């Protein structure tokens, strides 16, 4: 069991400066020794063996080198501390004692397992103790994918390793939209390649003008030419110079660790494309290939220590209906304020296969049924994804109610069918769950064996049942006109569009034609009757030979509506062939969340994701963090922890950097815990006093300086600029942290790294929002609509704990109004925004900054409408000095639809319509109607329609993010909001009227209302 | 039989207000809706099926051969695998009865608050239990180490102790015995801290189930207080 707090001892957040430590010596002598809380094990051992010569049996003490410290951690394990640099407080001790022993066993294995356990947040030994055969079979077998990935890493010994660690950060397509192509000079771009010439860094430039579509090797060649111009060489001599030394060098981004290792167009690289769009000049750095491969570890992979006639008929042979016995329940916490019954039912994912059957009403105090329930369904008609959802409910007849639920996969991971006696510990009911069963609920028995444990007996047949192999299903499978107008219209309707029974059977009938229009496969699968081996067998054979569809559409087949294994296998194969690494990073959140839905531990999706994580560290990093940030939840803990064990046992030497990140986050969690709990009611001056005091201590400085930012491990975090670090005003007690950028030329990118660490709020909302904002900006730019967004980084690292990128030199409109000053006027006056933008952008800069403002503002307005985001006043919208607008605080989904009662959204007043209308076109008291506002409107309209054109994508995104128990993402009814904002039922040209009407209404409502500054109440 | 009779017909009420109007209901509970037109929502197989009614030339039907020219004859035809319809969802289900709809909502919110003032003290208790479970596990292993430490003593020492006795040095062995005695003392002290933590374990295991019982008593009420406070459409800012 993982430890509950990030304290240094059990129930103490911080060790007092001086602690008494009971040292158990290797001669059986106990010696209490006063240690400093920050003291290393080295010095503690030294001062122990010094003051231990005072105690008897002192001659037996060997050299202190030949001994190692051992103790009990807060996880309740024996940690043998092999690293003796570690400080006392960083030991995570249960209580302050230290046993001194001599080393035993293999040291390498002990160390590696301890590092894996630290990374996870759970000691690895707990997995060894687990007895479920599926768990150990997964642990053993998944190493196949691990070995394959490490083999691909060492396939090209020098280069492939570099590709694994520093994969090319590129866009999906090299095709450069034309409004971007125009931004550069006649099809080419200005670039600056730098060279570091000596150690105590001197620097020399090479300003090149290069075709925008050149590969890195070609850029290096042009730089070599630049240098070998002053050189005295023949024409064929220059030729031989370049030819031989083209590929003896490599390019890096000045100021971060992103390298141009692959043969891509320079514009396809995200950094250079960014430079083009933003008009900034790319600053690269030349570097000898040897000078990089030297800094690679050569990390290998070695197998762990856990890598160590029966009568069977097929399921197609059994003739009977499914029947299961309900024996008894250990206990129920009933008040006897009323009779209970066991409601059961067989389900194929969300929907039940047959009709739900119940047990009899029995005494509440004495719980026994012992009754053989029959289910109205045929046994061979069972699909592969069949499973049993059941629950214990109560009565007053008058008022039903559920108490403890449970789900079980009706087949094994081996394909065997359940039979005989079984005990299932039940799970509790979520806070606001009033359903009689838990269908979407996780499958399997409760690890907590103390909660209610139901016992039952499934039907035992003559032999051991199994689900038939695919060939038998194909054997079974082997037994017009023109209605195509519809097929090319129902395949274009969003996933949540109703599927009528007429259309269901119309699709199932003309199914062998559907292959022509492959993207209709989702809808088609929903129109199948899954409790029929007949239709299931036919559909299987259609699935196997189905045309690969675009990856964005195949993701749909991985959400909850499609639980059949062949469907998911098809989607996984689609991803394996057609999905780019770029978008795999882009959609990783949904891909990780979707692992939960799969029936069994070992499957095709987990293997695919683990392989791609062990093949690309930019995937593997966020793969790791997304899995670790869900280890707090017990329902997923085991699956995600086993997967994390698999990854950490193969990622190689990045594991140590991950450990550094974990260590740092742990210290931050603990510090904020103190600020929130113990020092709750202290003034801010004293909390900041404590903050400075505690950060300056060496355990913190060492632990939280020099590591990779989890927000983007391409950024190194250097030394803390403490004078900038501060506690934020927010009640939840955040931490504003500032690092130097250690990069050799941090001058050419990030001067300062600034991150917010907040311990309090759930960030999954913000994360999903920003990811969607990012997707939208991508869509608009591919369609030649230059709307510059700012989807700042955000990463949840644990239960309501995460990180937030800071945007340099940005301010809230609240600020700009106040920050701009009073200037003699108690009131900001609302105009001020325009004059603050004018005071920071003068001359010709003014017009371009205004363009930036309007282009950003339009996109953010459209996105704030399409997505259910309200609460948009002068404290959520921010402006940079160059004039880029961007929104923050994406806390609520789908317009608080879950929240409150549901009778609003008829009227929404936007406060700052005038304040922006002044910037979007200067002056002119009538800026209700100017040419520039007309251009603003056209932009917003085009953006709205552009998202509407791709709507299915966002529907699928939200539908995949239903695995996460998010506040405003629980049922499809939630997701149905964007169907209304986009008006997918209304025709393309009716939806533009929808949008324009809503916008006009909000604008005028804003013209009238009053803001009441601080509390933002109204006056009308 | 008319355009709107108020027996099984609603307007364009969303799909969110259908599933819950026939959730966990028998094979039958049905209603008529509108489409992007008419719609028929039906229940069978433990599932919710959706059938469209094509209305062209003022006529209605399902299959290809049209067999009706009105809305309400269609229902009674099949009413008495096209399985029949059973139970309809009535429209009139319970002078200016609006003020009374405070007293029935004031229960829910307060009964929600009192449930929230319980689920919190359920979660807080729940995790607090697991904490103590692990701490006992910690103490156990800690004890083992000290018991192993004692084995190290009564083995390395019993060669010096049984060497000074044959040499004459009692108050040297008295130091070794003072040490061993303090070692055993720090064993019994840990055992007692662990026994007290098991006492708190069972205290919290009883308090936990009391919280669970109270929740099991409260829960049936909140669901029934959900259907009593339904709103009336078309009216603004009722409190
Ligand atoms: C200049 C401006 C105008 C608007 C609206 C009021 N006007 C139009 C917008 C587009 C096209 C035409 C008009 C028109 O009325 O002609 C803005 O709306 C929002 N919101 C998003 C939509 C909400 C309902 C949530 C209100 C908040 C934000 C955040 C703005 O920055 C914004 C800026
Ligand atoms: C994106 C983002 N950028 C920020 N930058 C700044 O605040 N500043 C930059 C230098 C001056 C200073 C200022 N304006 O006071 S905070 C933030 C942000 C994102 S979510 C968030 C909540 C804490 C409100 C949740 N906050």
């Amino acid at each position: 069991p993982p430890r509950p707090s990030s304290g240094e001892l059990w129930g103490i957040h911080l060790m007092p400066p001086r602690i008494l430590v009971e040292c158990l010596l290797p001669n059986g002598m106990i010696v209490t020794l006063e240690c400093l809380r920050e003291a290393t094990l080295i010095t503690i051992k030294h001062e122990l063996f010094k003051e231990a010569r005072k105690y008897p049996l002192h001659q037996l003490l060997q050299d202190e080198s030949s001994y190692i410290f051992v103790s009990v951690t807060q996880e309740a394990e024996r940690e043998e501390f092999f690293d003796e640099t570690r400080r006392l407080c960083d030991l995570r001790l249960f209580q302050p004692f230290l046993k001194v022993i001599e080393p035993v066993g293999n040291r390498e294995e002990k160390i590696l397992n301890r590092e894996i356990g630290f990374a996870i947040g759970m000691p690895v030994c707990e997995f060894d103790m687990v007895k479920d055969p599926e768990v150990q079979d997964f642990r053993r077998n998944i190493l196949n994918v691990c070995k394959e990935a490490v083999d691909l890493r060492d396939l090209n010994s020098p280069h492939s390793r570099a590709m694994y660690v520093y994969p090319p950060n590129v866009e999906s397509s090299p095709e450069l939209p034309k409004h971007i192509y125009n931004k550069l000079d006649k099809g080419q771009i200005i670039v600056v390649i730098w060279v570091i010439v000596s150690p105590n860094n001197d620097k020399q430039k090479y300003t090149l003008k290069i075709n925008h579509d050149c590969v890195p090797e070609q850029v290096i060649a042009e730089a070599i030419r630049k240098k070998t111009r002053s050189m005295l060489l023949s024409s064929e001599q220059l030729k031989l110079c370049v030819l031989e030394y083209q590929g003896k060098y490599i390019l890096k981004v000045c100021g971060c660790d992103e390298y141009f290792l692959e043969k891509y167009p320079l514009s396809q690289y995200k950094y250079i494309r960014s430079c083009i769009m933003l008009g900034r000049m790319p600053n690269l750095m030349l570097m000898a290939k040897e000078s990089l491969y030297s800094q690679l570890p050569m990390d290998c992979f070695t197998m762990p220590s856990y890598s160590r006639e029966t009568s069977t008929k097929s399921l197609w042979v059994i003739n009977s209906a499914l029947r299961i016995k309900i024996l008894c329940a250990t206990y129920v916490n009933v008040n006897i304020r009323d009779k209970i019954y066991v409601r059961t039912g067989i389900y194929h994912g969300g929907e039940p296969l047959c009709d739900n059957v119940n047990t009899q009403r029995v005494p509440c105090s004495n719980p026994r049924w012992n009754e053989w329930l029959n289910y109205d369904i045929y046994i061979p008609d069972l699909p592969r994804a069949a499973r049993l959802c059941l629950s214990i409910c109560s009565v007053k007849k008058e008022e039903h109610c559920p108490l403890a639920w449970g789900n079980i996969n009706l087949f094994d991971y081996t394909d065997t069918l359940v039979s005989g006696k079984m005990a299932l510990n039940l799970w509790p009911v979520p806070h606001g769950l009033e359903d009689l069963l838990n269908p979407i609920g996780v499958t399997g028995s409760n690890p907590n064996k103390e909660t209610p444990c139901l016992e039952l007996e499934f039907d035992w047949f003559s032999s051991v049942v199994k689900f038939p192999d695919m060939s038998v299903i194909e054997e079974h499978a082997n037994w017009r006109e023109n209605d195509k107008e519809q097929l090319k219209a129902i395949s274009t309707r969003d996933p949540l569009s109703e599927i009528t029974e007429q259309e269901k059977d119309f699709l199932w009938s003309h199914r062998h034609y559907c292959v022509t229009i492959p993207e209709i496969l989702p809808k088609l699968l929903l129109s199948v009757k899954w409790n029929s081996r007949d239709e299931v067998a036919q559909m299987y054979c259609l699935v196997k030979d189905w045309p690969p569809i675009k990856p964005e559409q195949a993701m749909e087949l991985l959400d909850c509506n499609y639980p059949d294994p062949m469907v998911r296998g098809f989607a996984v194969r689609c991803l394996e062939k057609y999905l780019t690494d770029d978008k795999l990073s882009q959609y990783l959140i949904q891909l990780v969340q979707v692992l939960k839905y799969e029936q069994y531990l070992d499957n095709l999706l987990v293997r695919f994701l683990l392989k791609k994580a062990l093949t690309n560290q930019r995937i593997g990093h966020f793969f790791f963090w997304h899995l670790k940030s869900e280890m707090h939840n017990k329902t997923v803990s085991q699956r995600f922890g086993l997967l994390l064990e698999s990854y950490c046992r193969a990622c190689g030497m990045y594991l140590k950097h991950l450990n550094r990140q974990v260590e740092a986050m742990e210290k931050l969690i603990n510090l904020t815990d103190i600020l929130k709990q113990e020092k709750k009611d202290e003034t801010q001056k004293v909390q900041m006093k404590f903050l400075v005091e505690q950060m300056r201590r060496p355990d913190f400085m060492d632990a939280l300086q020099g590591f990779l930012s989890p927000l983007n491990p391409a950024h190194q975090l250097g030394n803390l600029r403490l004078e900038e670090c501060r506690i934020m005003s927010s009640a939840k007690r955040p931490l504003w942290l500032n690092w130097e950028n250690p990069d050799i030329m941090s001058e050419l990118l990030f001067q300062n790294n600034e991150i917010i660490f907040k311990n309090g709020d759930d960030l999954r909302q913000d994360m999903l929002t920003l990811q969607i904002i990012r997707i939208m900006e991508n869509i608009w730019q591919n369609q030649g609509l230059d709307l510059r967004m700012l989807p700042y980084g955000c990463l949840s690292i644990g239960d309501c704990v995460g990180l937030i990128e800071v945007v340099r030199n940005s301010h809230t409109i609240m600020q700009i109004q106040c920050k701009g000053g009073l200037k003699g006027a108690l009131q900001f006056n609302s105009h001020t925004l325009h004059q603050w933008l004018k005071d920071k952008n003068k001359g010709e800069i003014y017009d371009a900054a205004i363009d930036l403002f309007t282009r950003s503002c339009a996109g953010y307005c459209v996105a704030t409408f399409i997505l259910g985001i309200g609460d948009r006043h002068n404290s959520n919208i921010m402006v940079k000095d160059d004039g880029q607008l961007f929104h923050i605080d994406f806390g609520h989904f789908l317009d608080h639809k879950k929240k409150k009662f549901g009778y609003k959204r008829e009227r929404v007043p936007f406060v700052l319509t005038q304040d922006f209308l002044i910037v979007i076109s200067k002056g002119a008291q009538e800026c209700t109607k100017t040419r520039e506002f007309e251009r603003f409107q056209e932009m917003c309209y085009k953006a709205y329609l552009a998202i509407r054109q791709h709507a299915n994508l966002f529907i699928n995104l939200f539908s995949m993010m239903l695995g996460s128990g998010m506040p405003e993402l629980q049922s499809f009814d939630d997701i149905a909001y964007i169907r209304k904002t986009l008006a997918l039922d209304k025709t393309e040209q009716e939806a533009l009227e929808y949008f324009m009407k809503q916008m006009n209404d909000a604008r005028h409502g804003g013209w009238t209302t009053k803001m009441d500054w601080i509390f933002h109440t109204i006056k009308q | 039989m008319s355009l709107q009779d108020a027996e099984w017909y609603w307007g364009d009420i969303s799909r969110e207000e259908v599933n819950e109007k026939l959730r966990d209901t028998a094979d039958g509970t049905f209603l008529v809706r509108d489409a992007s037109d008419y719609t028929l929502t039906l229940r069978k197989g433990g599932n919710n099926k959706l059938i469209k009614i094509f209305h062209r030339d003022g006529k209605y039907g399902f299959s290809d051969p049209l067999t009706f020219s009105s809305v309400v004859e269609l229902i009674n035809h099949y009413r008495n695998l096209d399985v029949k319809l059973l139970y309809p969802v009535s429209k009139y289900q319970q002078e200016a009865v609006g003020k009374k709809l405070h007293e029935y909502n004031t229960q829910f919110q307060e009964k929600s608050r009192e449930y929230d003032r319980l689920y919190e003290e359920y979660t807080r208790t729940s995790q607090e239990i697991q904490m103590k479970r692990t701490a006992i596990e910690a103490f156990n292993e800690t004890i083992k180490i000290f018991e192993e430490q004692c084995q190290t003593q009564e083995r390395y020492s019993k060669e010096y102790i049984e060497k000074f006795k044959r040499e004459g040095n009692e108050k040297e062995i008295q130091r070794i015995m003072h040490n061993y005695d303090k070692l055993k003392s720090r064993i019994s002290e840990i055992i007692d801290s662990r026994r007290r933590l098991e006492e708190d374990l069972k205290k919290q295991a009883a308090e936990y189930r009391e919280i669970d019982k109270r929740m099991n008593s409260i829960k049936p009420d909140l669901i029934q207080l959900r259907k009593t406070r339904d709103q009336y459409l078309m009216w603004l800012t009722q409190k």
Side-chain angles (χ1 to χ4, degrees), chain B residues 41-199:
Chain B
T41 62
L42 188 145
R43 173 139 193 162
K44 246 153 244 170
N47 270 311
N48 292 25
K49 310 288 186 172
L50 297 155
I51 313 97
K52 195 181 185 187
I53 301 93
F54 304 102
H55 82 112
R56 196 123 299 172
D57 197 16
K59 285 169 159 190
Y60 305 87
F62 301 134
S63 190
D64 207 338
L66 183 106
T67 168
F68 311 94
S69 65
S70 58
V71 177
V72 197
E73 192 174 39
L74 175 61
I75 298 288
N76 289 18
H77 179 263
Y78 295 83
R79 212 173 192 184
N80 295 64
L81 189 59
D82 298 346
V83 180
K84 308 180 198 303
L85 294 167
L86 300 191
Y87 320 108
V89 176
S90 186
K91 174 159 159 65
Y92 307 120
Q93 190 65 224
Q94 179 55 77
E95 293 177 351
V97 186
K99 297 178 180 189
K100 292 175 180 184
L101 236 47
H102 272 242
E103 293 171 13
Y104 291 109
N105 186 53
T106 310
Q107 296 178 245
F108 168 80
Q109 301 173 274
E110 281 192 30
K111 216 106 193 186
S112 182
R113 291 173 203 172
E114 192 244 325
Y115 175 83
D116 292 12
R117 294 160 187 172
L118 244 162
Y119 192 79
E120 193 89 358
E121 204 179 335
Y122 178 84
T123 302
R124 294 202 307 102
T125 297
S126 183
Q127 290 182 129
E128 269 195 52
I129 298 151
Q130 282 278 2
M131 263 166 152
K132 285 171 174 168
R133 281 223 196 85
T134 70
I136 296 159
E137 294 177 49
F139 275 122
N140 292 359
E141 193 64 12
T142 311
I143 290 163
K144 198 171 180 181
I145 287 166
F146 278 64
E147 287 181 331
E148 288 165 19
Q149 178 79 352
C150 280
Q151 294 173 7
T152 311
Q153 204 268 353
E154 295 170 345
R155 191 200 149 185
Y156 274 119
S157 69
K158 206 180 177 187
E159 272 183 294
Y160 271 94
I161 289 164
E162 298 192 335
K163 198 228 78 171
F164 302 125
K165 287 192 176 212
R166 303 188 279 95
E167 202 178 45
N169 196 350
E170 197 72 19
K171 284 174 176 175
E172 167 55 45
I173 307 162
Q174 297 279 107
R175 294 168 59 202
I176 296 169
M177 292 295 95
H178 177 241
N179 178 278
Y180 167 83
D181 273 339
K182 282 187 168 183
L183 180 57
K184 182 71 182 179
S185 168
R186 192 78 169 85
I187 287 172
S188 45
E189 288 177 327
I190 298 176
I191 284 173
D192 287 27
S193 292
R194 192 260 273 104
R195 195 176 68 82
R196 166 163 31 80
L197 199 63
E198 294 162 323
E199 301 291 63

Side-chain angles (χ1 to χ4, degrees), chain A residues 382-582:
Chain A
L382 279 171
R384 189 62 184 77
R387 50 194 207 83
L388 168 61
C389 295
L390 55 91
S391 63
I392 290 168
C393 308
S394 58
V395 296
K396 200 179 193 169
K397 297 288 191 183
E398 303 291 335
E399 284 155 287
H400 298 207
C401 236
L403 292 86
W405 71 269
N407 301 344
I408 286 173
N409 285 327
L410 285 171
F411 291 83
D412 284 15
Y413 71 100
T414 50
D415 299 301
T416 304
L417 175 133
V418 295
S419 57
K421 149 88 170 185
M422 189 174 179
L424 180 81
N425 284 262
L426 302 179
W427 306 81
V429 177
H431 177 74
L433 194 139
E434 62 175 20
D435 299 343
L436 291 177
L437 260 52
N438 202 331
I440 305 178
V442 296
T443 291
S445 185
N446 194 329
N448 186 27
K449 310 299 184 183
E450 290 282 359
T451 30
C453 161
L454 193 78
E455 318 140 23
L456 44 83
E457 188 176 8
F458 288 94
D459 206 352
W460 165 255
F461 300 94
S462 59
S463 71
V464 179
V465 189
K466 272 204 171 191
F467 196 95
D469 49 311
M470 235 68 66
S471 60
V472 177
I473 303 164
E474 289 184 43
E475 283 272 19
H476 177 90
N478 286 320
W479 221 235
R480 273 61 213 90
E481 318 323 300
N482 190 286
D483 303 42
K484 311 166 190 176
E485 312 103 25
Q486 298 190 330
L487 265 59
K488 285 175 184 168
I490 52 167
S491 78
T492 61
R493 274 151 54 175
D494 70 84
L496 306 188
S497 192
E498 173 158 320
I499 321 169
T500 67
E501 300 295 336
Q502 283 94 330
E503 292 160 29
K504 280 201 173 190
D505 286 326
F506 168 74
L507 271 170
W508 168 246
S509 62
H510 301 112
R511 63 178 172 276
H512 294 268
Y513 168 81
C514 287
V515 175
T516 54
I517 308 163
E519 63 270 14
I520 205 175
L521 181 53
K523 296 298 195 307
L524 172 65
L525 290 157
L526 287 167
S527 305
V528 182
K529 311 174 195 190
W530 291 101
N531 52 332
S532 303
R533 58 200 279 276
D534 314 338
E535 301 204 9
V536 168
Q538 295 193 48
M539 186 46 67
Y540 274 18
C541 303
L542 275 173
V543 162
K544 184 165 185 178
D545 300 337
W546 196 277
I549 66 174
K550 297 204 174 186
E552 289 83 355
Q553 310 154 348
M555 272 174 242
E556 193 181 338
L557 302 175
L558 299 174
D559 88 83
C560 14
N561 297 312
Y562 316 80
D564 189 83
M566 253 46 69
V567 174
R568 295 175 153 285
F570 167 73
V572 166
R573 228 174 300 121
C574 266
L575 275 31
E576 286 178 343
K577 290 174 188 174
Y578 281 49
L579 179 66
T580 69
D581 287 301
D582 159 57

Side-chain angles (χ1 to χ4, degrees), chain A residues 142 146 606-614 623 643 646-647:
Chain A
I142 198 66
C146 295
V606 292
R607 287 171 172 269
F608 166 66
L609 282 177
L610 182 71
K611 189 160 188 177
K612 275 290 179 187
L614 298 167
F623 179 69
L643 183 51
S646 304
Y647 173 82

Side-chain angles (χ1 to χ4, degrees), chain A residues 853 857-858 860-867 869-872 877 885 887 908-914 916-917 920 928 933 936-938 940-941 995-1004 1006:
Chain A
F853 182 96
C857 176
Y860 259 103
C861 162
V862 163
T864 316
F865 174 80
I866 294 171
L867 299 162
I869 297 168
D871 208 277
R872 296 291 100 192
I877 295 89
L885 204 79
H887 293 220
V908 171
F910 179 50
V911 179
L912 301 162
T913 326
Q914 282 80 265
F916 291 173
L917 283 167
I920 308 152
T928 305
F933 181 70
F936 175 85
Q937 286 183 309
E938 274 285 326
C940 300
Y941 305 153
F995 182 70
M996 294 183 54
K997 274 175 232 140
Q998 304 262 42
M999 296 290 119
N1000 285 268
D1001 293 337
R1003 172 232 307 180
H1004 285 295

